[PDB]
Amino acid sequence: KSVPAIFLDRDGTINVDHGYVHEIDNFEFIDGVIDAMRELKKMGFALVVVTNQSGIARGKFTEAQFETLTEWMDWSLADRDVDLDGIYYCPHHPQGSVEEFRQVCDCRKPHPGMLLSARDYLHIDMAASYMVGDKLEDMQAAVAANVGTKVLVRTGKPITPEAENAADWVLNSLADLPQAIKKQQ
């Protein structure tokens, strides 16, 4: 049977975007998101991170550093009873300085590749799922993927009118999501 999911940006949604974050010391969980994620799991949602990480293509940090940080994030969440169901990332950029990652791709939001991948691997009911992000490109990827509810938060990049045009909900932060969902009945 198919499960509903919350799809999540990383920077600006889960962690404070201090700028090309790739080190444990600069990874700061946003207030209340761990508790919120725990509650979302309890509410029956799969949790799937779908993150653009163009810092890799830019040369700001290596894919290995991202992998190390991601393992740590995964550990840290699991240790607090939050087991992520999937972690997807896109390291690419068409103007990448690092040749290995210099390309157009299907996984860089607004392309919905990461969400489609997660859908297939975890058997996700997209129409009953949510996407949470901070920018237009996230909302565009969500509509392409048939995600039922498109949610912006205010904890990341400043919200643009175009992002709002493409979103259903705007919340202060991911910490507000469980209550907003419960209120839907």
Task: Tell me the catalytic residues.
Answer: 9, 11
Q: Confirm or deny that 31 is annotated as ligand binding.
A: no
Q: Confirm or deny that 89 is annotated as ligand binding.
A: no
Site for Zn ion in 98-127 (CB under 5 A): 105, 107-108
Q: What are phi and psi of 19, to 5 degrees?
A: 105, 110
Give burial (CB, 10 Å; 0-12/13-18/19+) of 25: exposed
**Between 56 and 77, CB nearer to Zn ion:** 56
Helices (H), 28-160: 33-42, 55-58, 63-79, 113-122, 136-144
**Between 21 and 107, CB nearer to Zn ion:** 107
Confirm or reject binding of residue 92 to Zn ion (CB under 5 A).
yes
Q: How far is the CB of 179 from Zn ion (least distance, A)?
A: 33
Q: Confirm or deny that 105 is annotated as ligand binding.
A: yes
Binder among 14, 21, 50, 90 for Zn ion (CB under 5 A): 90
Give burial (CB, 10 Å; 0-12/13-18/19+) of 114: buried
**Interface with Zn ion by CB under 5 A: which residues?**
90, 92, 105, 107-108
